[PDB]
Amino acid sequence: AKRIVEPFRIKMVEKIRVPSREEREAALKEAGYNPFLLPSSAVYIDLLTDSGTNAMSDHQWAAMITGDEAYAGSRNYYDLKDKAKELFNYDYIIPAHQGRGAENILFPVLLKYKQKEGKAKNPVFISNFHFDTTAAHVELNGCKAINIVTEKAFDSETYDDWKGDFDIKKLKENIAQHGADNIVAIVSTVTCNSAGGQPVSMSNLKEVYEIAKQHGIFVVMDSARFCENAYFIKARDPKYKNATIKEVIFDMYKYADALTMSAKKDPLLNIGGLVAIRDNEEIFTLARQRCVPMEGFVTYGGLAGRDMAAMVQGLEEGTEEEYLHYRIGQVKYLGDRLREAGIPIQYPTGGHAVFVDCKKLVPQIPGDQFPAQAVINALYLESGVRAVEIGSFLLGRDPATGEQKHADMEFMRLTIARRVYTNDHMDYIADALIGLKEKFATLKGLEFEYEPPVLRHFTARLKPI
Amino acid sequence: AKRIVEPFRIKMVEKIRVPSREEREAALKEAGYNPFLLPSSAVYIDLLTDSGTNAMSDHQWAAMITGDEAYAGSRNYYDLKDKAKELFNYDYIIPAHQGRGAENILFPVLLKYKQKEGKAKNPVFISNFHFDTTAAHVELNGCKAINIVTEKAFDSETYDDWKGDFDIKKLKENIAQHGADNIVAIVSTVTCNSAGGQPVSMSNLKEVYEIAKQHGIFVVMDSARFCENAYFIKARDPKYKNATIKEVIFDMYKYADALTMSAKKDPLLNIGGLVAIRDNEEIFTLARQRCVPMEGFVTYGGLAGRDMAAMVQGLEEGTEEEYLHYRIGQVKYLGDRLREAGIPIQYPTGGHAVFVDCKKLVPQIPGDQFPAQAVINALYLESGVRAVEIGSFLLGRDPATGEQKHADMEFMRLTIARRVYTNDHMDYIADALIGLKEKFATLKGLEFEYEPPVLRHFTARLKPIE
Amino acid sequence: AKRIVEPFRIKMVEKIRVPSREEREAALKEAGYNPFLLPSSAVYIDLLTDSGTNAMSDHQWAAMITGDEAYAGSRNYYDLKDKAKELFNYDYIIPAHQGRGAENILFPVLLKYKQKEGKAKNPVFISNFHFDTTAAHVELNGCKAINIVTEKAFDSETYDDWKGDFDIKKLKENIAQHGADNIVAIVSTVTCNSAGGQPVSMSNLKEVYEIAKQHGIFVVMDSARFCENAYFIKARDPKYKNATIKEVIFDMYKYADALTMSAKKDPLLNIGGLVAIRDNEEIFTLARQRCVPMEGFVTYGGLAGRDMAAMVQGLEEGTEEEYLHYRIGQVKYLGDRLREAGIPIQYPTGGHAVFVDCKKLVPQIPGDQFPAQAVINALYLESGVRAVEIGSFLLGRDPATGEQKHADMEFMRLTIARRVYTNDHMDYIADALIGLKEKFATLKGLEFEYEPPVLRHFTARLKPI
Amino acid sequence: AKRIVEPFRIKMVEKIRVPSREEREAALKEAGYNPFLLPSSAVYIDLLTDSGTNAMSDHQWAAMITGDEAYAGSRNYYDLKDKAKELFNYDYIIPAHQGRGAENILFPVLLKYKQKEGKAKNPVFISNFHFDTTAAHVELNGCKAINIVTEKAFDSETYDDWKGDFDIKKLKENIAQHGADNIVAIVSTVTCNSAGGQPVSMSNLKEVYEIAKQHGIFVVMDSARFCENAYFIKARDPKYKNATIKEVIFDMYKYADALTMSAKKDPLLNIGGLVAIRDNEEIFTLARQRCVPMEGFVTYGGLAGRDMAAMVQGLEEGTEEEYLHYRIGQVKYLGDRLREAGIPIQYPTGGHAVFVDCKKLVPQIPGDQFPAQAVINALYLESGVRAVEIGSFLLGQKHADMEFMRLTIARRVYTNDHMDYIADALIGLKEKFATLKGLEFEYEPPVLRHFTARLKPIE
Numbered sequence A, C: 001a002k003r004i005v006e007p008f009r010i011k012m013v014e015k016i017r018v019p020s021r022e023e024r025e026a027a028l029k030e031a032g033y034n035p036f037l038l039p040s041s042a043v044y045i046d047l048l049t050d051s052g053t054n055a056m057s058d059h060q061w062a063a064m065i066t067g068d069e070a071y072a073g074s075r076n077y078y079d080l081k082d083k084a085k086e087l088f089n090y091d092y093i094i095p096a097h098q099g100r101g102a103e104n105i106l107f108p109v110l111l112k113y114k115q116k117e118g119k120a121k122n123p124v125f126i127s128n129f130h131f132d133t134t135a136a137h138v139e140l141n142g143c144k145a146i147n148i149v150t151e152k153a154f155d156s157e158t159y160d161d162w163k164g165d166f167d168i169k170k171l172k173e174n175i176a177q178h179g180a181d182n183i184v185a186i187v188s189t190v191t192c193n194s195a196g197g198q199p200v201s202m203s204n205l206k207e208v209y210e211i212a213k214q215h216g217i218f219v220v221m222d223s224a225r226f227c228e229n230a231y232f233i234k235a236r237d238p239k240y241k242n243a244t245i246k247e248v249i250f251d252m253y254k255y256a257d258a259l260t261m262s263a264k265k266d267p268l269l270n271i272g273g274l275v276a277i278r279d280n281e282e283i284f285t286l287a288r289q290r291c292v293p294m295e296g297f298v299t300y301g302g303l304a305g306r307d308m309a310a311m312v313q314g315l316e317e318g319t320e321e322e323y324l325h326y327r328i329g330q331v332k333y334l335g336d337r338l339r340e341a342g343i344p345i346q347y348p349t350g351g352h353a354v355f356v357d358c359k360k361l362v363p364q365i366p367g368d369q370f371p372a373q374a375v376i377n378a379l380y381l382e383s384g385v386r387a388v389e390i391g392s393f394l395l396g397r398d399p400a401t402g403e404q405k406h407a408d409m410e411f412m413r414l415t416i417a418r419r420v421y422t423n424d425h426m427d428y429i430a431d432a433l434i435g436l437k438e439k440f441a442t443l444k445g446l447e448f449e450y451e452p453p454v455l456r457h458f459t460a461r462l463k464p465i
Numbered sequence B: 001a002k003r004i005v006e007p008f009r010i011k012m013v014e015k016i017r018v019p020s021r022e023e024r025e026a027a028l029k030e031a032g033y034n035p036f037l038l039p040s041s042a043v044y045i046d047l048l049t050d051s052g053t054n055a056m057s058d059h060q061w062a063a064m065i066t067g068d069e070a071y072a073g074s075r076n077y078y079d080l081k082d083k084a085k086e087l088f089n090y091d092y093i094i095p096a097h098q099g100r101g102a103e104n105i106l107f108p109v110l111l112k113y114k115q116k117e118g119k120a121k122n123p124v125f126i127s128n129f130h131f132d133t134t135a136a137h138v139e140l141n142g143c144k145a146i147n148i149v150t151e152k153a154f155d156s157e158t159y160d161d162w163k164g165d166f167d168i169k170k171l172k173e174n175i176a177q178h179g180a181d182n183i184v185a186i187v188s189t190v191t192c193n194s195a196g197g198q199p200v201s202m203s204n205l206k207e208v209y210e211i212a213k214q215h216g217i218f219v220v221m222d223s224a225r226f227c228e229n230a231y232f233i234k235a236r237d238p239k240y241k242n243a244t245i246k247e248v249i250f251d252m253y254k255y256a257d258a259l260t261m262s263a264k265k266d267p268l269l270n271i272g273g274l275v276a277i278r279d280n281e282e283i284f285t286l287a288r289q290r291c292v293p294m295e296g297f298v299t300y301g302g303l304a305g306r307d308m309a310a311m312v313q314g315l316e317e318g319t320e321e322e323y324l325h326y327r328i329g330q331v332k333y334l335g336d337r338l339r340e341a342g343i344p345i346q347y348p349t350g351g352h353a354v355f356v357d358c359k360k361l362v363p364q365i366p367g368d369q370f371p372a373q374a375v376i377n378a379l380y381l382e383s384g385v386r387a388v389e390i391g392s393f394l395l396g397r398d399p400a401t402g403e404q405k406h407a408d409m410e411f412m413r414l415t416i417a418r419r420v421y422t423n424d425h426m427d428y429i430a431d432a433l434i435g436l437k438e439k440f441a442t443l444k445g446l447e448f449e450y451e452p453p454v455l456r457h458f459t460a461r462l463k464p465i466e
Numbered sequence D: 001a002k003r004i005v006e007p008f009r010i011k012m013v014e015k016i017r018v019p020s021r022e023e024r025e026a027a028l029k030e031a032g033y034n035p036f037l038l039p040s041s042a043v044y045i046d047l048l049t050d051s052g053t054n055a056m057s058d059h060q061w062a063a064m065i066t067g068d069e070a071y072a073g074s075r076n077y078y079d080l081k082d083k084a085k086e087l088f089n090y091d092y093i094i095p096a097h098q099g100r101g102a103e104n105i106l107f108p109v110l111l112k113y114k115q116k117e118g119k120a121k122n123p124v125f126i127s128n129f130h131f132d133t134t135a136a137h138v139e140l141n142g143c144k145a146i147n148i149v150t151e152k153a154f155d156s157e158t159y160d161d162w163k164g165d166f167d168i169k170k171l172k173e174n175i176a177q178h179g180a181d182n183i184v185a186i187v188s189t190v191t192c193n194s195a196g197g198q199p200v201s202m203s204n205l206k207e208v209y210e211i212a213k214q215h216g217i218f219v220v221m222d223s224a225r226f227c228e229n230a231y232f233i234k235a236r237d238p239k240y241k242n243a244t245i246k247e248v249i250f251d252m253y254k255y256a257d258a259l260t261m262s263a264k265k266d267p268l269l270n271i272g273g274l275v276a277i278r279d280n281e282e283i284f285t286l287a288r289q290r291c292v293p294m295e296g297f298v299t300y301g302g303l304a305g306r307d308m309a310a311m312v313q314g315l316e317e318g319t320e321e322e323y324l325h326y327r328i329g330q331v332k333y334l335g336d337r338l339r340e341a342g343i344p345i346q347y348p349t350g351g352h353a354v355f356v357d358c359k360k361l362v363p364q365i366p367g368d369q370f371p372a373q374a375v376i377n378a379l380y381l382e383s384g385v386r387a388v389e390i391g392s393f394l395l396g397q398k399h400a401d402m403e404f405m406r407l408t409i410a411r412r413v414y415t416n417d418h419m420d421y422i423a424d425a426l427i428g429l430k431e432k433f434a435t436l437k438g439l440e441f442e443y444e445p446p447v448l449r450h451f452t453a454r455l456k457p458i459e
Ligand SMILES: CC1=C(O)/C(=C\N=C(/Cc2c[nH]c3ncccc23)C(=O)O)C(COP(=O)(O)O)=CN1
Pocket: B048, B049, B050, B051, B098, B099, B100, B101, B131, B132, B133, B134, B189, B193, B222, B224, B261, B262, B263, B264, B272, B273, B388, B415
């Protein structure tokens, strides 16, 4: 394990505290054994998400202070437009309040666009892996969300450079089975969140885009963690060994027609999202027509002016290789601590989180009893650290059959907010999980009490078995 | 006209400037003669809206700096929950990113809830006046938005205390015509924005709510300007002469079952919204399940923690009567200057804006050519002040006939952000509009070039009829 | 009277409240009938000073957030150095924590420098008018503070363009009487605070400086209100009718060798000061050696880095002519409201405050009895407004005689902070003072219960008669 | 070496960068081989001082935003007064712009007060150790600054619990030698900055006060690092094992009549100072009379209202034991990395810095050549770390025998990963220790040379 030094120093701090063991026992109980329902006061180190919990820079705060709050035509809207043209070469932007607002703007518009000439009667979206909000917006619009990530993502312990890659073979099979007229769009998720924050390679992105253009399919880059994906392409693809991060990013976006971004991830924000469209002005115009009732006027999209200002500055800071080397180096430090102590993880670690393979850590719990959640619950009761489950619990149920979607991966996700926690905080997280060495086989799964029909993991209430 | 002094002093400023006439003329053509498409840099004083442009206090900024950005369980969510219980006596909250996010959470839930028990077969919503994003969500979900504001709202020059009131006769007639089963909800808009920011009386709120419960109809308080409405109740209803503003608000919300709020108006914020539900936990649970895919997790709802913290403090500051007296007195001062000069306005002025009656100011322009928009564009080329149209352009086409919804009133809305402009800014606005007294005749209407199907006035480009 | 619109809009507000007459009377007695000893909570509109009470711009706050707090070599120290070269053409700067800190750094250095040559056996300083802390530092260093303002300043109701001017005949008289070897420095105070914020003409500054060089005498510009002085030069001097404000300022500082500045005035700050020296490197070095024990290291001078950053920005905003036009016009609006009702004021109004002539308003109270302080107290009891005395109270006793210095003016100063109050606040002040027309003849002065030996008006406790 | 986790998380960051080795030698050249003349843009990790470079909390920045900027009677002045009464039990406050502003207010007043009845004809001040600005103000007013730290502070490698103590024997001897009428005040400096940030025990503070009160001598507590001292007392005095940090502090200030404070240290500020007086109203009145010409009006003292607001909150946060344990543990972690690798340091480490003895690292450079400055320059050229010299360059040649480079650590600014960068730089200098040459004056000022002198390597 190698500690990589921060390429910054601290300017402002926020207190944290360890709640007592009896606080955590009561809190988890009151929260229905779902840490999503805990108050933050009951949490020590929060590893629930890397979304919106990032520490901004003094430059981002100063940009907020001078942000233009004008309802129409904010100065910051035009800076954000130029920045998106600078980084992605995309000519149209619509701000959104966060990533699932961008998906609510774009995905219904793509469906209606595809349904011209009476096509897309049995419509589907195709992705390496639809994350939860993305798949929910696909299915809420009456489509199937099809995930075709490479099967090397399924062998946790075996190294591979690109575990977020599309399976090109399955992509061709799905185009053959469904037909190009049913494929509303392809979604390239960079990095692949559900596979473990694992990068998609540039040739993979290129190859998927070639096939899509052959068949007239629209391609959307789910871009929440694009800077982490660009760093991995520079690190693992020899063809980009001497490229700047921005140069890799520019090339990534030659292989999509539009993007949906949660700016709460790699742009280092606490709120914000973005739709950018390359050159298709009709899809842009239709999305603007949906933005107005759902999000806001097309020059702020449900954001305050200051948050567009912070996003402009965040989009620059998130591409800095010195910062990305440290950020992804910190994730790698935590993974190497756990791996050295015999804890199975998705290897190599991805950009934003260590994914602990609980299918190997707790074999006595079947996947539909949520094994990673039993581990998460025990880790919290022992340490005050709050983690999150990326497995059968999050995967949910098939819209058609109403049964559990089969999960090939049962991950506990230790999600690391950017520039928030030190490597000493990582050591606490590592030692806490390692201290559970003798209790893993003792753990038992969980059973529902209240299950939402959609995105159930957020508010479900569980009971032990 | 009477000038009322600020109950505050200035702690931070932001420069503004006056574009040259050369820039304004050019900027308007580049904007398609739709001021909504002007860059803010081309605007001197911005009267487009009172939404999200407000100046916050130092205490509001301090609340932001210590805001808790946690994804789940932010301390500011629990503060917001207690604050809603304090102000409205409502036990459930869901934050939203702004008012139309709150509408998108709640209104589809209310429809499906009634549909699930075999009702709402031909569904309608009824309001004193649905505002545009509110009506847009009604229509997007397959329902009809019915507006029944008192006819006194159309008698602009004649003073009345409660020009936002429901027409009670018309409420009962619609309930009989459509049936209670088909009425998804009644929406009480306070103040009534479309009628000129005009207040709804307490006794009108109470009668509407009592009729609603007799028929099992859910009532939603559209609450963006609830503090301005409450100030008017204290000012004009003798029963509330000696009540506090909070006591007036507490009584107002006895006459609804839920609220949707744009916290960008009276809570004095730059972003933010809220759903609050009095005590219907099933509606609450259904609203939360829609919040998650559309807005965000149920304890931040598409807001930053710092914005929930700012809302908690702003909800307090927006009820302060010395602030409300000053704010509404500034709007009144602007209207008095215009009304002194013969310009017809909705009288008395409402809480957030002066509404100029352009059907009385420029009779030569027909309603479907948007006479208020012609006056707005001339005021911009003359002064750099950007105003907004509240008439046919905003009312739009009927989603069933595809033709112009008949506009009983053509208003140019001079909308005043809270604590942003001084009374000397008000004098500049009034002097410029009075300065167009000789050119109101020679003003002609406008036609469409690109018309959106929903909420057309925003991105539409207009062609001068000449 | 003419109301001039703010060339800004409001971005942040701070509550104020009117204390009840009962609280006012209790607080005034507890403060020893000296409003300097009132807590701010007992004050509605504060007109005690225009020092450190200004409202900053969003850009000033954005500069604070990114300020460099380094102990040595702050980025903002160098930016401030560059700003002084641009504005004043001066080559050396020493930041100070405020104006009297600048005077403490520089005045002892100028005296020892004059003595090292063998001179200064009976040392004096000469100014159009030394303000209080300036004269206190002159006297604390063993020198006499001689004031020779134009006689026009004593003719309060009669208009004159340049009531802050040096009396040229008296300058030569004092140079002949004391000898050039005894004059440590000439202090050009711009605007002349004690004469009523009244401007010094460019031709007067030039003639003073040329007389000073003739005799080898160092010239210091007391520059707390140099931008207001510059606006008056453009407005009233035909030579500069079409010059920019910055061009006026650059010409002003051709007529001095160094400057001491409270940045809490015209650079729109809440704290801060500055020494700038034109080119005399020896004085700069000696002043640096005194900066270290009294203020701090020479690259921050007792300021946080954020306050240097705000000063750079404020130096620029303080010179914008649209702002000065409004600021001075608001002072002029309040003065005109008072003058139209028959209240005698120093006319024309100066840059920062309206000076009410209380020798004429309350002729029954002798000067030694402080008639202006009687009007101030009455105004406060009536309205919550706190004003300050610029007469015999502030002038204090003479170090040699020990008795009251002869006061040629007895003013109540209504001091206006920058960008803080609106013209409706000005109307409130005007109506309050105008409403006291009947009570003016009935007022009675005060006596000393506790008199500090130096700068007695800040902390003295008085008792009516 | 044990790493102690931060009891906080990061809310706002500020970029740092490593300048190239060519920039370092060119900038150190322009700086005249004096690190104080480097711009910050030339410095990677700044270890020059723990004064004014601290990271504030979100609560401190919120307090600034609502700060009352009124000239007279700021809301935050009264808050600060109450906070001094709570923490110290002292009844009178005067804000100052920083520590040496507070000394400029109080020390000339104490001298005039002692002279009131034909006394103090040969006046002196006595301290466990006067810091530089403290000693400079004493001498600028015509007094001698006598330093009488315990002898165990001079044995750098040998542990002792209280290396900042007064030598009680010397205190009684100096009282007898100078007479209690010439002792204007005793200055108890906590922690003892010049001894290495080393604490003063409660019993030492107690006995010193008892002696002074018997002789009618005024006792001033120099309080810049009072919380760090309070932590060491609770950690090393068994009587206080179970006391809170605030209870320790309350007890400390029973043994003084006044305090001067740089709030730029333990109160976690970027600017700010404080005078507080226990109950002597006459000294308070005279101190206010000097505040007005020198600092500002007596309710802000040369501070913005926002900075007084931040001070009130910082005084609370600087007492938090979880934070102090981490803060003093991080300095100790750097010290242990160095001590475990054969680098001589003042042992144990103090509250705010690590002192490295360079006279033993470069046994080729004599005292008349500034060995610690050559190590500092060598450390800056290989890491970008700017440390300060406390040896033959702190000219106030006289004597020295102590050639220490100080590694001063700002509060809540640098991680233990930054500490490792620093330690590995100073340990990685083994290969170039022997080949390091001395430094000569290329340009020397007559006074305060280490602030502005220019040097050049000796060939
Ligand atoms: C009563 C009520 C409102 O007034 C209301 C918003 N009003 C606005 C803002 C904006 C919305 N459409 C417009 N058309 C023309 C000019 C401006 C606007 C206003 O400027 O009037 C909302 C929606 O909340 P939000 O804006 O999503 O947060 C719900 N209900």
